[PDB]
Amino acid sequence: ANLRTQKRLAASVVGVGKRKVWLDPNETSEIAQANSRNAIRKLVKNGTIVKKAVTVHSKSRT
Amino acid sequence: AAQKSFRIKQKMAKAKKQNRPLPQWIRLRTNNTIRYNAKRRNWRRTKMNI
Amino acid sequence: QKIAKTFTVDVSSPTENGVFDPASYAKYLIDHIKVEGAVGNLGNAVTVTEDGTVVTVVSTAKFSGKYLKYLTKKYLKKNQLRDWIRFVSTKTNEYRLAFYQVTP
Amino acid sequence: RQKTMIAEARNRKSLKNKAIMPRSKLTKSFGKMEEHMSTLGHDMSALQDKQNRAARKNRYVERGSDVVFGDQDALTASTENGVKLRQTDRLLDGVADGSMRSKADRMAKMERRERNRHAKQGESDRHNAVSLSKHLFSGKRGVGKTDFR
Amino acid sequence: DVVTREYTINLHKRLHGVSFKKRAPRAVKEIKKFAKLHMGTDDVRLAPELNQAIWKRGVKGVEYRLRLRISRKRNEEEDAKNPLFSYVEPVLVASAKGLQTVVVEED
Amino acid sequence: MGRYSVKRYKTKRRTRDLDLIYNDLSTKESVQKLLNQPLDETKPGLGQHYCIHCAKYMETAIALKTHLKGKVHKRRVKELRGVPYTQEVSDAAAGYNLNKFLNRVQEITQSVGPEKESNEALLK
RNA sequence: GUGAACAGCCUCUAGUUGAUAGAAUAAUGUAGAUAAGGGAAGUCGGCAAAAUAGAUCCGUAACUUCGGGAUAAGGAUUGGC
RNA sequence: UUCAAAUGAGAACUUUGAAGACUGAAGUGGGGAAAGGUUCCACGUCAACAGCAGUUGGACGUGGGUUAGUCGAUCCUAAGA
C-alpha cells in the first residue's frame, strides 16, 4: 500500500536522508505493520533495512 | 507567525471549532429546512481577514 | 630496538567445510609478499607460516593489517570465492574468515 | 572467459550513479549458492549438511490455539467501522440505528448533488463571479496611455 | 509449447534517425515489437537486467548489437487472454558478431 | 567545415610551399636577395625583417629574435629538415621509371645534401 | 575540482522526477547553426550577424582642465612531458 | 524518463525495488522574518477538485499534537503620538 510514511520515519530515526533508506520488496508485510521508532529500530537490527552509505567521491586524480 | 496576540489566537481557535460540516442527525427531525451549512469555510478559498 | 608485529588469521570454519586451500594461500603469500617496492626482495625480515587452521605472519619492517586484509581479499577474488567468503577480525590484529547469512 | 567476465562486471557495476550494496550485509539463498558451488566444483558433501540444521522452525509453524484463531474472520467485522480507536464521533454517535445511519448517508449523497452540478470545490467553496469587468468594458483606446498591453 | 530460442538484435536497424531524447524508449518499444513479431503472442514482459543493459551505456548511447533470449511461459489461471506469454532475458557475449539464433533445450 | 579550419585556410589566405622554400634556400644567391630588397610599402613589414622559413614579415625589427626563439619557427625548421621530394618521386613510386629517380636522388645527395647546411652556417 | 572568482561547467550531503502522452517527421516558425566565390553593391538605416576577446613581453600618436586619453592602434607567444 | 513487483474492478502518473537523470551549497537543502491559521500528522474514504486519468493529495469524514526563573513580549528610550 503506502510506505512513504514508513520510509520517512525510518530515515529520521536512522539520521540519514529519505533517499538513503533501503527496503525489501520480498518482505513488506512487517514494514507495513511497523509504525513506531522501536519497531523501526528492531527491524533495522534484524537487518531488513540497510544504510546504503555515501557514494564514492574519489580525489585520486586531483 | 507564531507571535499572535491572545485575542487573535482566540479568534482563530473559535474559527477552527466552527469549521465543521453538518451533523448527520439534524436531517432526521420533522419539518426540516437545513440542507448544507453555508458558513463552512476552508483556508484555500476564503480568507477570514482576522 | 625494532619491535616485530604479529598477525593471526583463522580460517577454521570454511577450511573444515572444504572450500579453502590454506597451503595455496600460504604459497601465494610467500610468492607475492611485497615490502618496500618490488616483490620478492624480502631481506629475511618478514616470515609466514601455516599450521592447517591459522595463518600467522610476523613482520619487522613496514607492514599494516589493512594491507594484509587487502592482499587477502585480492587473493580471495583471484580464486573467485568472494560473495561467499566473509572476512572479519576477532580482536585487535587477529582476524577470521566465515560464511554469510544465506539462511534460506 | 575474461572478455565475458569483464562484460558482466561492466554491466553489473553501476558504481557511478547511486551506490553498491555491501556484500557483508546482503541476504542470499543456499538454493542460489548451490549452482555457484557446483560450478566451482567443490565438495557439496559438507555443504548440504547444513540443510537439516534448519529443522528448528519446521515444527514452529504449528502453534495451536484454534489453529491460529480459525482463519481471518474478526477482521471483516472489525473493519466495518468508519473510524477506529475509542473516541466520540460527532457523525457516527449522533445516530444509533443503522437503518437511520444509511438514511443519513443517502441524504448526504443526494444533497452533495447540487454542489456537484455547480462544480464547487465542496460544501465550503463559495467563490462567486462578477457579471462584468470595469477594466474590460469601458474606456476609449485612443493614442497615448493605453488601457493595457 | 514452452520453448526457448536465443535470438540476436541490432538496435541500428530500428533506432536510426530518431530523436536523441527518446533513444532508450524507442529501443524498448522496438525490442517489444520485435519479440511480438518473432513469437506471435499477446503479452510480452521485459527483464530488469535487460533494462539495465540497454540504459547502462547511456540514455542516448544505446549499443547496437545486444543479445537477448525469449522464453514462452504458460499463463496462470484466470487469464482471459491466453496461455501465451513471452518473457525476455539478456545475456552478454564477448563479441557481438559471430552469433546467430540458437534454440536451447529445456533443462 | 565552416569553422576555424576553413576560416584560417581559406583560398584567399595561402602560404608558400615547401618546394619553393627548398629552392630558395638552396639558391645561395637568392638567400641574400630574399631580404636585401630596396623598399616596400604595401606589406606591413615595409620590406624588412621577413623570416624565410616561416614565410612572414615581422612588421618590426626586434620581433625577429623573439620569433626565432619561439617554438613555431623551430617547428617549421624541423619540417624543412625532411627530404623535399616532388611529383616525380610519386610518379616513380606509382609504377614508373626508377632509374631516373635513383640518379636524381644520388645527385641530390652528392651535391645539394650538405649545401643546405653550408648555406645555413654561412647565414647564421 | 577547473580559475583571478561566490562566473559558467561536472561532482558530494541533501531534494525532486512534478509541468497531458503515444505514432511519423511535408510546407509555413520559434532558438540555433552551417555554407563554395565576391565582400555592405540596392537596405531609412553595417539593426539581430561576424570578427579581436584570457594571460605575458615590446613599442604606443593627435589633443590636453598636463590629472588623462590608454587595454589606444599593432605585433610575438599560449599543449604534453 | 525506463522496467519489474505489489495493491487495486480497472496503473504512462499510487507504493517499493532495479536503472537513468537533474537542482550543483547566492540550491529545487537546512532555519526563519511579514503574512498565512490547522493546511502538520494519523486513520477510513474519491460523487465534487488537482484542465487528462487518478487505487494518490496541500481534496473528503473523524481525531491527536505546541509544556520557558534563562527563548521573545511584558522593562527603558529615539524620530514621534
Side-chain angles (χ1 to χ4, degrees):
Chain A
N2 177 22
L3 300 177
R4 301 184 298 101
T5 81
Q6 290 75 355
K7 176 257 300 180
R8 165 193 57 181
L9 294 184
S12 179
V13 76
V14 164
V16 303
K18 48 186 165 177
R19 73 181 183 94
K20 292 300 185 181
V21 178
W22 189 93
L23 291 81
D24 178 22
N26 312 268
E27 183 69 22
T28 59
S29 60
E30 183 68 22
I31 65 183
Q33 288 293 149
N35 55 29
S36 70
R37 314 285 60 68
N38 38 263
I40 304 300
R41 291 265 66 99
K42 74 178 181 180
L43 63 86
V44 300
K45 197 271 179 181
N46 298 331
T48 67
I49 292 190
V50 333
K51 327 297 290 189
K52 50 175 49 182
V54 53
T55 176
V56 184
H57 185 177
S58 171
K59 311 293 183 302
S60 60
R61 42 204 168 193
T62 66
Chain B
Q3 297 281 44
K4 61 197 62 57
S5 75
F6 173 77
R7 55 187 304 179
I8 303 304
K9 199 195 202 68
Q10 237 283 12
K11 202 81 179 180
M12 298 189 182
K14 184 163 181 300
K16 173 183 174 300
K17 178 179 180 300
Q18 185 71 18
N19 178 266
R20 269 298 188 271
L22 281 182
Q24 300 183 0
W25 67 283
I26 268 66
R27 294 88 176 269
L28 298 185
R29 307 304 307 270
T30 63
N31 187 19
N32 309 6
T33 60
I34 316 297
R35 307 296 299 274
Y36 90 99
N37 67 103
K39 291 190 177 181
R40 237 283 182 170
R41 118 273 179 187
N42 52 5
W43 71 281
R44 297 174 62 259
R45 303 305 301 179
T46 57
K47 316 167 184 297
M48 63 294 302
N49 301 23
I50 305 300
Chain C
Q1 302 180 6
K2 180 60 62 180
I3 169 64
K5 192 58 190 60
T6 311
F7 292 92
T8 63
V9 184
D10 187 8
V11 208
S12 62
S13 174
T15 303
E16 290 182 1
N17 174 271
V19 295
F20 201 85
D21 25 326
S24 299
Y25 270 69
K27 190 176 185 301
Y28 167 80
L29 294 181
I30 293 181
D31 301 336
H32 198 356
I33 177 172
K34 189 228 66 60
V35 281
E36 188 62 34
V39 187
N41 57 325
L42 189 144
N44 313 339
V46 183
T47 60
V48 323
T49 174
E50 175 52 67
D51 73 330
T53 305
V54 54
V55 40
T56 303
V57 289
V58 177
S59 65
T60 61
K62 165 66 182 59
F63 190 81
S64 72
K66 310 303 296 180
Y67 180 45
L68 179 59
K69 166 62 166 297
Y70 175 84
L71 296 183
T72 306
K73 63 162 170 285
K74 175 180 179 181
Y75 194 60
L76 176 60
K77 59 98 185 308
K78 175 183 178 60
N79 196 19
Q80 211 286 302
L81 300 179
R82 193 53 178 268
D83 176 80
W84 313 301
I85 291 186
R86 147 90 280 106
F87 194 106
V88 275
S89 62
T90 71
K91 72 169 191 179
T92 160
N93 315 318
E94 295 190 358
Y95 319 132
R96 67 175 174 86
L97 273 60
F99 287 93
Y100 286 87
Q101 51 285 10
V102 280
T103 167
Chain D
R1 287 302 180 182
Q2 64 87 10
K3 197 60 62 180
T4 305
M5 290 301 180
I6 185 180
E8 293 177 359
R10 185 172 57 184
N11 179 29
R12 295 173 302 179
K13 271 180 182 179
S14 67
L15 333 168
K16 185 199 316 301
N17 196 337
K18 296 182 173 181
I20 27 188
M21 307 287 293
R23 304 294 182 87
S24 61
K25 220 213 59 52
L26 282 179
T27 62
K28 299 293 189 303
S29 176
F30 202 9
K32 171 258 184 181
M33 292 310 190
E34 181 179 0
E35 285 75 12
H36 297 67
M37 292 295 101
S38 181
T39 301
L40 270 303
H42 292 3
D43 194 8
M44 308 300 110
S45 305
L47 292 170
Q48 192 269 285
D49 55 354
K50 312 305 297 177
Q51 177 60 219
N52 80 325
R53 155 219 45 84
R56 313 171 313 276
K57 62 179 181 180
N58 50 340
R59 305 180 184 91
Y60 290 166
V61 57
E62 200 286 329
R63 202 276 326 271
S65 303
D66 192 14
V67 193
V68 60
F69 205 69
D71 85 76
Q72 312 295 334
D73 51 330
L75 287 173
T76 303
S78 58
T79 192
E80 298 292 338
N81 302 330
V83 296
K84 293 185 177 182
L85 310 177
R86 300 304 301 112
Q87 78 293 346
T88 62
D89 187 345
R90 57 173 305 170
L91 267 54
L92 179 58
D93 302 325
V95 178
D97 199 333
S99 177
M100 304 301 103
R101 171 66 44 178
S102 56
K103 182 61 60 189
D105 190 10
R106 192 94 57 84
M107 291 285 298
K109 295 281 302 180
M110 158 271 302
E111 187 58 36
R112 301 190 324 268
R113 188 202 324 263
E114 299 294 335
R115 277 85 64 180
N116 292 8
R117 217 293 309 176
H118 299 346
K120 304 302 180 180
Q121 293 187 9
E123 301 180 0
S124 59
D125 186 13
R126 300 155 304 175
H127 174 46
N128 298 271
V130 65
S131 188
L132 279 317
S133 164
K134 163 71 69 174
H135 59 276
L136 295 181
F137 294 90
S138 176
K140 315 302 176 180
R141 285 163 190 80
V143 71
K145 306 175 183 178
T146 55
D147 299 5
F148 47 83
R149 182 178 178 272
Chain E
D1 303 72
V2 178
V3 302
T4 316
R5 31 189 60 173
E6 309 180 359
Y7 289 177
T8 171
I9 262 298
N10 84 96
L11 291 195
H12 242 44
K13 177 76 66 174
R14 285 159 285 271
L15 296 190
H16 172 233
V18 80
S19 65
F20 278 179
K21 197 55 184 55
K22 301 183 300 300
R23 302 302 295 260
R26 267 267 66 94
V28 166
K29 299 297 299 301
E30 296 303 330
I31 285 180
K32 65 180 74 277
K33 290 301 297 300
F34 172 86
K36 172 66 60 59
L37 265 302
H38 283 236
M39 160 55 223
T41 181
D42 60 335
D43 300 330
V44 46
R45 294 308 174 273
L46 299 183
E49 299 78 355
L50 182 64
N51 205 27
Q52 291 179 337
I54 60 184
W55 285 86
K56 181 59 179 60
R57 192 58 87 86
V59 53
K60 60 176 185 179
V62 289
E63 202 277 349
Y64 332 105
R65 286 275 180 182
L66 56 94
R67 183 74 183 178
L68 45 75
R69 59 173 59 91
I70 305 303
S71 301
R72 270 215 294 262
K73 297 180 180 179
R74 192 174 189 270
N75 278 313
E76 83 300 334
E77 298 292 338
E78 295 82 33
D79 197 322
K81 301 181 180 181
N82 55 10
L84 300 180
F85 178 32
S86 59
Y87 159 83
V88 325
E89 172 72 17
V91 45
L92 301 183
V93 292
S95 181
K97 307 297 182 179
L99 47 87
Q100 59 183 5
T101 165
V102 169
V103 179
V104 284
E105 305 293 337
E106 182 181 359
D107 184 70
Chain F
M1 66 178 181
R3 313 298 191 283
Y4 169 85
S5 65
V6 59
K7 303 306 294 178
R8 262 56 177 182
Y9 297 86
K10 190 254 180 177
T11 49
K12 171 60 183 179
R13 36 201 48 78
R14 308 299 297 270
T15 64
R16 305 301 91 181
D17 58 67
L18 315 182
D19 356 335
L20 75 85
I21 296 175
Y22 275 112
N23 299 329
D24 61 59
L25 290 181
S26 177
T27 306
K28 154 70 198 58
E29 292 71 9
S30 77
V31 179
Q32 301 295 336
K33 302 177 181 179
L34 250 293
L35 270 304
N36 302 335
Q37 34 228 328
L39 191 142
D40 191 2
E41 185 270 349
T42 300
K43 299 303 180 180
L46 297 322
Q48 307 301 326
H49 314 282
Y50 166 80
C51 45
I52 314 101
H53 320 277
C54 301
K56 189 55 184 61
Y57 308 89
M58 291 263 75
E59 180 265 0
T60 163
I62 60 181
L64 174 62
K65 55 177 304 304
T66 71
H67 184 66
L68 289 182
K69 298 179 181 181
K71 49 155 291 301
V72 175
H73 191 88
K74 292 184 178 181
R75 166 179 309 174
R76 187 55 56 88
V77 170
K78 291 184 301 180
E79 292 300 329
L80 296 182
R81 283 186 176 183
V83 181
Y85 290 119
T86 179
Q87 178 63 26
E88 294 187 0
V89 180
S90 299
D91 296 0
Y96 219 61
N97 195 350
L98 191 62
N99 298 329
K100 182 179 180 180
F101 162 78
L102 292 180
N103 295 330
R104 179 176 180 177
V105 170
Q106 291 180 0
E107 291 181 0
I108 282 179
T109 305
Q110 290 180 0
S111 181
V112 84
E115 184 69 21
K116 286 87 59 180
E117 303 179 359
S118 182
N119 290 25
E120 294 149 11
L122 292 181
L123 180 61
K124 177 183 178 181

